[PDB]
């Protein structure tokens, strides 16, 4: 089904982006 | 104990013995920084967590009597730091490691340091040892960017001659100006106390950034994953880029005439020389000269070792060929028991 | 079973520079307008600071440098360093 | 002189009739851990860059 | 507004459109190469497409992501080219990975190609109606044994450049050799390390005071002789 | 280079390899616990796997994302352990959630286990051929009634640490009690506060000047008595 | 089909990340 | 079928977030 998959993928992408922001701002990385 | 701190001369094999003495060597200064009580994060990591032998090699390489502009003879890098401001330990470690052109990694359950020291080849890879994805090609190459390639660099160094003040020194290449654009970058030479050292650092940065401009990633089976620990030098010979036949696993061999039966149509040199390298029992690299290719398919080696069974991979080396070297920087492990290697 | 989506990243790392792949590169300090146009060194402090905020520093060779003053006090001196030679006039 | 502790002084030029003089005494902390002494004898101390 | 002729704009109104054709020109003269003409498709005769008299040969080329904007970042569209038989790798190993060249994209409608592309012969041909864009190659993000991806950029894009190019130095020059400021035109006298040579192929200034004194152009020195401004 | 023996290196290149076994050791002795040996697999007799004489009991475990790198953040591989019957919860509330311990991962090829793991008996046995790694537990990101997830980190990781670890001066001392810098070894005289006591159990120092006066040890005080330098 | 799905997910994980970047820097986030 | 798709989408979203951070940290843009 379209809309359910779209909303699920959007929320999962938001969670992934939040996790990436959290993990890259520790000591090194590119210091976002 | 083996290290004389006056003439910087080594004499004999070194053991895990330390003595208190004055020194201004960068590698041992970093070693003191890493492990020390009070302020040197000694309560966090022990003395056995860092590769002291890598530090010994770095220190031995540090004193090489490079020629200076004034006609003198000075060591390549001299440790001169006066840290008077609290800052993150990772930042201080990176600043220390940026002077000797090194990089730290957690290799072999120990912290070790690697640098761009000319070394020997370790292992070889061709189409047979690598695995291609669904796309069709196993090796993925990439290059740098036009505006990423710096050619003008300014280095800040302290100048004891005039007033112990900061001074900026510029380094650039005219041919890089002609070929690409002008890309200016500033970086202070941490620990510098002589114009020669700052100039050497800038020249190293520009030369390394101009020559090393290609990075290749590929995949490797279990044997290679266990073999290469990290930050080693290997040849990645590829017949696709070389539009030739680099060689691969031979099928069967003989012993009387040494008729080696490969599986690809090879091609010998014109009139000078050519060799082929195979493996033995204790995984060596046995090289054998080649004279005549009987039947364009079968090879005749001079003194083959009777240890190749079926999976030995042969690499055929001609003359006047620019052998391709690679230094592994990124290694990734997955659950299918293959490794992803990204190298420069 | 299978382990898909390797997603080779050799291209992404070079985007920030290639010399950084072998050297972390030295950090650089910021510029204060108030301190005219002078450039601050990250490994030398010629000026003599105040013993408080600044952490106990470390030396590694040469560098005539300042310090962190712990106690400054001015009083009246004695007339005579020592011995019996104590003349005034 | 170096080793772990050292002291030194210069012969003061003073006197010439009863007067009074000041005395600035200041202690400085340089670094941490066992440091080596000055490169030179005593002329390493620089007051107003001399 | 665009430099669109009246005829093509009038044709681009009707419902029954013709076939859109995209042609690419890779220019490397400014970097040391030649001009390569590519087209994604060939005519009905199995021949290279003839436009304005010149010929574009067939080759798999695909440009995606052309986004002109005034805010945010710049535009970096992607060009994909099939690397079979090692053809792209051949010039990449020679032309420094196709860095610094120029790419020109021309789009045309089908009903305006040359008459030799059609068996009956087009009577509506007009080799002056096309839309043209130009970009510069920035990097070869990935060139495998089956393909090759190039990143494009605008020629005027600013990135990593500083405005006040002037830099104050103490004992090092700031400009080039013989270009505009070093008004030197005599015989070669010095080399990289200030050695007394008289050969023109090795004449390169050391960017010092000694080089200027050797070349008798110390009046045109870019390095101010301050040095001792921070000691006091 | 790695410390892998020649024979296992030779075997790893064989086209027909054997099974790969991973064994885990959790050491809490530096924290105050015991040594636990886990193996994701057992032998053909339904028995714990015997290696080097010791026994790794069968228990759920799975390590993921083991990466080594020199640039960017230090890698943090994860470990998953099934928490059924509350076995993990039994030590989590006792060992402070398994924070600060050590984990050792040994990988071994199936053709080198002890002979007791095979009904016929392996003749190609060598108890000195394995690959070893060690990490430290950082946090228990997830803990439920079905599983438990631990994050691993390198011992050398330098997150949240500052290089020069001195405060220079204060009204208070900045060391330990009875260490190798305080240099006190006498009988108990003071406690957490400034109260006289004579029991060794409650010997504590307030790390102020009063404590030093109590202990007749002032020459080793780590606080410079400036105070008025900030005011005057 | 594979590549269509992959391109769809890649382009869907763009505006999600952009919105996350923008919201986390407004008043009381981690400022990206 | 199940969590395999979830893991795939999670990795894809993390990669997309990394690319977005890299492209927004550059000279142009909002300087994340
Ligand atoms: S230094 Fe004197 S000679 Fe050499 S380039 Fe600059 S100006 Fe021309
Ligand atoms: S205060 Fe005096 S006694 Fe208490 S710890 Fe610091 S030094 Fe030892």
Swiss-Prot record, chains A, G, H:
Domain of life (superkingdom): Viruses
Compartment annotation: Virion
Q: How is it modified after translation?
A: Cleaved into mature protein H* by an unidentified protease.
Complex formation: Interacts with the tail initiator complex presumably through its C-terminus domain. Interacts with the tail assembly protein G. Interacts with the tail assembly protein GT.
Q: Which family does it belong to?
A: Belongs to the Lambdavirus tape measure protein family.
Q: What does this protein do?
A: Serves as a ruler that controls the length of tail by stopping the tail tube polymerization and is probably released from the tail shaft during infection to facilitate DNA translocation into the host cell. Assembles into a multimeric linear form possibly stabilized by the covering tail assembly proteins G and GT. Its C-terminus fixes the tail tip complex (J, I, L, K), thereby forming the tail assembly initiator complex. Tail tube proteins polymerize around tape measure protein, displacing the tail assembly protein G and GT.
The name this protein goes by in its record: Tape measure protein
Which species does the entry assign this protein to? Escherichia phage lambda
Phylogenetic lineage? Viruses, Duplodnaviria, Heunggongvirae, Uroviricota, Caudoviricetes
**What is the gene name?**
H
Swiss-Prot record, chain B:
Highest taxon of the lineage: Viruses
Coiled coil stretches, renumbered: none
**Where in or outside the cell is it found?**
Virion; Host cytoplasm
Q: How does it assemble?
A: Interacts with host LamB.
Q: Which family does it belong to?
A: Belongs to the Caudoviricetes tip attachment protein J family.
Protein role: Attaches the virion to the host receptor LamB, inducing viral DNA ejection. During tail assembly, initiates distal tail tip assembly by interacting with gpI, gpL and gpK. During virus entry to host cell, binds strongly to host LamB in an irreversible attachment. The binding induces structural changes in the tail leading to viral DNA injection through LamB trimeric pore.
The identity of this protein, by name, is: Tip attachment protein J
Please spell out the taxonomic lineage of the organism that makes this protein. Viruses, Duplodnaviria, Heunggongvirae, Uroviricota, Caudoviricetes
User: Which part of the complete protein is shown?
Assistant: 247 to 590 of 1132
From Swiss-Prot, chain C:
Q: Where does the protein end up?
A: Host cytoplasm
Transmembrane segments in this chain: where?
none
Protein family: Belongs to the lambda-like tail tip protein I family.
What is the annotated role of this protein in its UniProt record?
Answer: Plays a role in distal tail tip complex assembly. The tail tip complex is assembled successively with three tail tip proteins J, one tail tip protein I, one tail tip protein L and one tail tip protein K. The tail tip complex interacts with tail measure protein to initiate tail tube assembly. The formation of the tail tip complex is completed by the addition of tail tip protein M, which is followed by tail tube polymerization. May be excluded form tail tip during maturation and would be absent from virions.
Its recorded name reads: Tail tip assembly protein I
Name the source organism: Escherichia phage lambda
Parent sequence residues shown: 134 to 222 of 223
Curated annotation (Swiss-Prot), chains E, F:
Pfam families registered for this protein in UniProt? Phage_tail_L
| Swiss-Prot/TrEMBL cofactor(s) | [4Fe-4S] cluster
GO biological-process terms attached to the record? symbiont genome ejection through host cell envelope, long flexible tail mechanism; viral tail assembly
What is the free-text note on the cofactor? Binds 1 [4Fe-4S] cluster.
Keywords in alphabetical order, please: 4Fe-4S, Host cytoplasm, Iron, Iron-sulfur, Late protein, Metal-binding, Viral genome ejection through host cell envelope, Viral long flexible tail ejection system, Viral penetration into host cytoplasm, Viral release from host cell, Viral tail assembly, Viral tail protein, Virion, Virus entry into host cell
* GO CC field: host cell cytoplasm; virus tail
Q: Which GO terms describe its molecular function?
A: 4 iron, 4 sulfur cluster binding; metal ion binding
* Cellular localisation: Virion; Host cytoplasm
> What does the UniProt record say this protein does?
Part of the distal tail tip complex which plays a role in DNA ejection during entry, and in tail assembly initiation during exit. The tail tip complex is assembled successively with three tail tip proteins J, one tail tip protein I, one tail tip protein L and one tail tip protein K. The tail tip complex interacts with tail measure protein to initiate tail tube assembly. The formation of the tail tip complex is completed by the addition of tail tip protein M, which is followed by tail tube polymerization.
Q: Report the NCBIfam families cross-referenced here.
A: phage_tail_L (TIGR01600)
State the family it belongs to. Belongs to the lambda-like tail tip protein L family.
Please state what the annotation says regarding this protein's domains: The C-terminus coordinates an iron-sulfur cluster.
Name the record gives this protein: Tail tip protein L
């Amino acid at each position: 089904i379209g809309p359910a998959a779209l909303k699920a993928v959007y929320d999962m992408a938001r969670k992934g982006a939040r996790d990436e922001i959290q993990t890259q701002m520790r000591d090194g990385g590119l210091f976002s | 104990s083996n290290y004389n701190p006056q003439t910087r001369q080594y004499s004999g094999i070194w053991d895990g013995t330390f003595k208190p003495a004055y020194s201004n060597n960068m590698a041992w200064c970093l070693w003191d920084m890493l492990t020390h009580p009070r302020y040197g994060m000694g309560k966090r990591l022990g003395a056995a967590d860092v590769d002291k032998w890598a530090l010994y090699v770095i220190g031995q390489y540090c004193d090489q009597s490079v020629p200076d502009g004034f006609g003198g003879t000075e060591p390549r890098i001299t440790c001169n730091a006066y840290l008077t401001t609290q800052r993150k330990a990772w930042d201080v470690l990176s600043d220390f490691c940026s002077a000797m052109r090194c990089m730290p990694v957690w290799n072999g359950q120990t912290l070790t340091f690697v640098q761009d020291r000319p070394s020997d080849k370790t292992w070889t890879y061709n189409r047979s040892n690598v695995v291609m994805p669904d796309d069709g090609a196993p090796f993925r190459y990439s290059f740098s960017a036009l505006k990423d390639r710096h050619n003008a660099v300014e280095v800040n160094w302290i100048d004891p001659n005039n007033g112990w003040e900061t001074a900026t020194e510029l380094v650039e290449d005219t041919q890089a100006i002609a070929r690409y654009g002008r890309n200016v970058t500033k970086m202070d030479a941490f620990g510098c106390t002589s114009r020669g050292q700052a100039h050497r650092a800038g020249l190293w940065l520009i030369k390394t950034e101009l020559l090393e401009t290609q990075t290749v990633d590929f995949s490797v089976g279990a044997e290679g994953l266990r073999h290469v620990p990290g930050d080693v030098i290997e040849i990645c010979d590829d017949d696709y880029a070389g539009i030739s036949t680099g060689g691969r696993v031979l099928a069967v061999n003989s012993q009387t005439r040494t008729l080696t039966l490969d599986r690809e149509i090879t091609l010998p040199s014109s009139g000078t020389a050519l060799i082929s390298l195979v493996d033995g029992s204790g995984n060596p690299v046995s090289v054998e000269v080649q004279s005549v290719t009987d039947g364009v398919k079968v090879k005749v080696s001079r003194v083959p070792d009777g240890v190749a069974e079926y999976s030995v991979w042969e690499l055929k080396l001609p003359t006047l060929r620019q052998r391709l070297f690679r230094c592994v920087s990124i290694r990734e492990n997955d659950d299918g028991t293959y490794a992803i290697t990204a190298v420069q | 079973g299978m382990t898909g989506i390797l997603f080779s990243l050799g291209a992404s790392m070079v985007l920030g520079g290639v010399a950084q792949m072998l050297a972390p590169k030295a950090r650089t300090p910021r510029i204060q307008t108030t301190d005219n146009g002078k450039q601050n060194t990250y490994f030398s402090s010629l000026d003599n600071m105040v013993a408080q905020g600044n952490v106990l520093p470390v030396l590694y060779g040469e560098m005539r440098v300042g310090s962190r003053v712990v106690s400054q006090e001015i009083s009246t001196a004695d007339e005579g360093d020592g011995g019996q030679v104590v003349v005034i006039g | 002189m170096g080793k772990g502790s050292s002291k030194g002084h210069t012969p003061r030029e003073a006197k010439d009739n009863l007067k009074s003089t000041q005395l600035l005494s200041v202690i400085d902390a340089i670094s941490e851990g066992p440091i080596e002494g000055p490169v030179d004898g005593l002329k390493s101390v620089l007051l107003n860059s001399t | 507004m665009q430099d669109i002729r009246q005829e093509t704009l009038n044709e681009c109104t009707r419902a029954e459109q013709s076939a859109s054709v995209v042609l690419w020109e890779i220019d490397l003269t400014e970097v040391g190469g030649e001009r390569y003409f590519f087209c994604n498709e060939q005519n009905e005769k199995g021949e290279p497409v003839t436009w304005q008299g010149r010929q574009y040969q067939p080759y798999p080329i695909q440009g995606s992501g052309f986004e002109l904007n005034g805010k945010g970042t710049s535009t970096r569209p992607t060009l994909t080219v099939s690397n079979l038989y090692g053809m792209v790798t051949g010039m990449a190993e020679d032309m420094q990975s196709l860095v610094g060249g120029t790419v020109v994209r021309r789009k045309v409608y089908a009903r305006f190609l040359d008459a030799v592309n059609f068996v009956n012969g087009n009577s509506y041909a007009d080799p002056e109606q096309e839309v043209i864009s130009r970009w510069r190659i920035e990097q070869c993000s990935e060139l495998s044994a089956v393909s090759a991806s190039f990143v494009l950029s605008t020629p005027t894009e600013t990135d990593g450049a500083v405005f006040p190019g002037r830099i104050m130095l103490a004992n090092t020059c700031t400009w080039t050799y013989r270009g505009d400021e070093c008004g030197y035109s005599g015989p070669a006298v010095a080399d990289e390390y200030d050695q007394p040579t008289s050969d023109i192929t090795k004449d390169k200034c050391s960017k010092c005071l000694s080089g200027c004194k050797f070349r008798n152009n110390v009046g045109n020195f870019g390095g101010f002789l301050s040095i001792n401004k921070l000691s006091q």
